[PDB]
Design an enzyme around this catalytic site. Structure first.
Site, short mmCIF file in Angstrom:
data_model
loop_
_atom_site.label_atom_id
_atom_site.label_comp_id
_atom_site.label_asym_id
_atom_site.label_seq_id
_atom_site.Cartn_x
_atom_site.Cartn_y
_atom_site.Cartn_z
N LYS A 1 0.78 -1.23 0.00
CA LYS A 1 0.00 0.00 0.00
C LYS A 1 0.81 1.29 0.00
O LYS A 1 0.27 2.37 -0.24
CB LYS A 1 -0.99 0.00 1.17
CG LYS A 1 -1.82 -1.29 1.29
CD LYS A 1 -2.77 -1.47 0.10
CE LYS A 1 -3.86 -2.51 0.40
NZ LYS A 1 -5.11 -2.25 -0.39
N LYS B 1 0.79 5.36 -4.77
CA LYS B 1 1.45 4.17 -5.32
C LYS B 1 1.86 4.31 -6.78
O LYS B 1 2.86 3.73 -7.20
CB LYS B 1 0.58 2.92 -5.15
CG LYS B 1 -0.80 3.14 -4.58
CD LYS B 1 -1.09 2.16 -3.47
CE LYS B 1 -2.53 1.68 -3.54
NZ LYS B 1 -3.35 2.19 -2.39
N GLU C 1 -7.18 -1.42 -9.77
CA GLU C 1 -8.34 -1.40 -10.65
C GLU C 1 -9.06 -0.06 -10.42
O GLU C 1 -9.99 0.30 -11.15
CB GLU C 1 -9.29 -2.55 -10.31
CG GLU C 1 -9.41 -3.60 -11.42
CD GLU C 1 -10.37 -4.73 -11.06
OE1 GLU C 1 -11.20 -4.55 -10.13
OE2 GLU C 1 -10.31 -5.79 -11.70
C1 LIG Z 1 -7.73 -6.97 -10.24
C2 LIG Z 1 -7.37 -6.31 -8.92
C3 LIG Z 1 -7.60 -5.02 -8.65
C4 LIG Z 1 -7.28 -4.40 -7.38
N1 LIG Z 1 -7.52 -3.08 -7.20
C5 LIG Z 1 -6.91 -2.49 -6.19
C6 LIG Z 1 -6.80 -1.04 -6.13
O1 LIG Z 1 -7.31 -0.28 -6.97
N2 LIG Z 1 -6.10 -0.55 -5.08
C7 LIG Z 1 -5.49 -1.34 -4.05
O2 LIG Z 1 -4.92 -0.75 -3.17
N3 LIG Z 1 -5.60 -2.69 -4.11
C8 LIG Z 1 -6.26 -3.26 -5.11
N4 LIG Z 1 -6.34 -4.62 -5.19
C9 LIG Z 1 -5.61 -5.39 -4.20
C10 LIG Z 1 -6.54 -6.34 -3.49
O3 LIG Z 1 -7.22 -5.71 -2.40
C11 LIG Z 1 -5.71 -7.54 -2.95
O4 LIG Z 1 -5.15 -8.24 -4.10
C12 LIG Z 1 -6.50 -8.54 -2.13
O5 LIG Z 1 -7.01 -7.91 -0.93
C13 LIG Z 1 -5.70 -9.73 -1.71
O6 LIG Z 1 -4.59 -9.28 -0.89
P1 LIG Z 1 -3.08 -9.64 -1.21
O7 LIG Z 1 -2.76 -9.16 -2.58
O8 LIG Z 1 -2.25 -9.03 -0.12
O9 LIG Z 1 -3.03 -11.21 -1.10
C14 LIG Z 1 -6.69 -5.24 -6.39
C15 LIG Z 1 -6.44 -6.58 -6.69
C16 LIG Z 1 -6.73 -7.15 -7.91
C17 LIG Z 1 -6.40 -8.59 -8.20
#
Ligand SMILES: Cc1cc2nc3c(=O)[nH]c(=O)nc-3n(C[C@H](O)[C@H](O)[C@H](O)COP(=O)(O)O)c2cc1C
Ligand SMILES: Cc1cc2nc3c(=O)[nH]c(=O)nc-3n(C[C@H](O)[C@H](O)[C@H](O)COP(=O)(O)O)c2cc1C
Lengths: 217, 217
Positions: B14, B74, B165
């Site tokens: 983050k 970020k 996203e």
């Molecule tokens: C397709 C996609 C879009 C996401 N969009 C965001 C986003 O805009 N901002 C963000 O901070 N995290 C985003 N996330 C992160 C997700 O919250 C995170 O992948 C999920 O909570 C699982 O946590 P981890 O990656 O620590 O295992 C996104 C994840 C994916 C796969």
């Protein structure tokens, strides 16, 4: 254990060696990879079926009997066969479930943090099912992400695999009771070790040049 | 044991440490990763934009407006930012690009075999852009698969990354003139190293139990 080498060395196995099977460890590693894949807001809008028995792979392969016969063999001969499934619609329950889980694991300090995370998850979930009316494809997209994760992950385990998109999702859905539980098949991934009938193991890897697909700014 | 540890330790960072950049080799590696990802029929209906400069990153961050402010940091603080883009419509001129690079890379032993793939690729594409009229989401699904492969890959390189996203697809597309080239942005992925402000680096990974998402048969 260098990831680029595995990325340049991995291939789509076209023929599996029915005799070589997965270690009970590798069998466990396969389920771990499926589970731990990231997702938007950690929605995890998926479901997996991991065929391990001949009766099971046949159940799956039963969906390739159409104009996808060449695919049938990969399914039956490979050790484990996983068919990635995506939810049909993002419901409030699955949402409460995800946040209740993140909380159970200790990801929230105050109950206010928990609420703020849920409101944020619902913000995106709503802009999909209410604003853009695409929650079904948004969810299907995450399942594909999970597949990209999987393909590289198993390849890094020294296993062969191949993503199958050539199969009748309609036949597969019916065969497992999907759609009734709110799911659909999207990709089938037979995993195991390859045999000499697999031509793609000797053939060089190909991709379009970086000067066409990539821009550096 | 290897990628599994990687898969369970990786996280959606983050907060990034602006001073911590990617080493010259790491920069080439992430590019290779974007390039060799698999895709249905090897169509590679994708395009990437990699922002490594301060000017490039600001241009991408322009898309982090309105309710997507929490993602601007970020996109600027991260060493490199990758914009995953998919084609908006699958046309024959591209199917010709793919087959020509496959022929050139030496995969076809006989001219009959080259014409055998062109037909295979065409038949798959034809039933998507004609019958179902969903080739836009089919190509988009391939891009997400690429993202999944990328997320695990950069993590294997010991790099941090967060899939985003939450950005404005129109601003990103406009700021880069993507519509005219035939592309649209789907996912943004800043990559570098996390700072101590990354509350997600120390938090425990949360996922649903396998008894809900997986059916072993
Ligand atoms: C397709 C996609 C879009 C996401 N969009 C965001 C986003 O805009 N901002 C963000 O901070 N995290 C985003 N996330 C992160 C997700 O919250 C995170 O992948 C999920 O909570 C699982 O946590 P981890 O990656 O620590 O295992 C996104 C994840 C994916 C796969
Ligand atoms: C979503 C998807 C669907 C595919 N469909 C099939 C299929 O039905 N049968 C098959 O043998 N290969 C299939 N492929 C494999 C591709 O042809 C292959 O990924 C591509 O040619 C690149 O080669 P590689 O996998 O060796 O890197 C598919 C791949 C993906 C990602």
């Amino acid at each position: 254990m260098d990831i680029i080498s595995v990325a340049l060395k991995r291939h789509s196995t076209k023929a599996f060696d029915a005799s070589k099977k997965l270690t009970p460890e590798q069998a466990e590693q396969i389920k771990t990879l499926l589970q731990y894949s990231p997702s938007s807001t950690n929605s995890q809008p998926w479901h997996f079926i991991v065929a391990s028995t001949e009766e099971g792979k046949a159940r799956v392969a039963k969906s390739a009997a159409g104009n996808y016969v060449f695919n049938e063999r990969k399914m039956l001969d490979a050790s484990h066969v996983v068919v990635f499934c995506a939810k049909t619609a993002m419901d409030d329950v699955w949402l409460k479930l995800v946040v209740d889980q993140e909380d159970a694991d200790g990801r929230f300090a105050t109950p206010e943090a928990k609420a703020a995370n849920d409101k944020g998850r619902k913000f995106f979930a709503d802009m999909h099912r209410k604003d853009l009316h695409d929650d079904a494809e948004w969810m299907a997209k995450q399942v594909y992400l999970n597949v990209g994760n999987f393909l590289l992950g198993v390849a890094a385990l020294g296993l062969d695999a191949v993503p199958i998109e050539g199969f009748d999702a309609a036949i597969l859905d019916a065969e497992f009771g999907l759609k009734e539980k709110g799911y659909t098949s999207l990709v089938v991934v037979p995993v195991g070790h390859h045999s000499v009938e697999d031509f793609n193991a000797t053939l060089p890897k190909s991709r379009l040049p970086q000067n066409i697909t990539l821009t550096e700014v």
